[PDB]
């Protein structure tokens, strides 16, 4: 009955734990320049 309600709180915790793990591992793509016109910057 009310067993379920507080267990519905440990949801959004893990939602955010999904979310930060989802996000910043993408953003890792420190030199990316291989030519003269590349290495201008």
């Amino acid at each position: 009955a009310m067993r379920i309600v507080m267990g519905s709180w440990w949801l959004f915790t893990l939602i955010v734990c999904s979310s930060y793990t989802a996000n910043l591992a993408a953003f890792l793509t420190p030199v990316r320049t291989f030519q003269d016109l590349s290495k201008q910057l």
Binding site: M2, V5, M6, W9, V16, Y20
Partner: peptide
């Protein structure tokens, strides 16, 4: 970003307060 943990935790303890306030009052009932 990283201190949302306790922002969920203390609200969960707030959810832990109401059913205890009704349970020990039912023991008083």
């Amino acid at each position: 970003s990283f201190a949302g943990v306790f922002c969920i935790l203390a609200i969960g303890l707030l959810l832990a307060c109401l059913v205890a306030a009704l349970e020990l009052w039912w023991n008083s009932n």
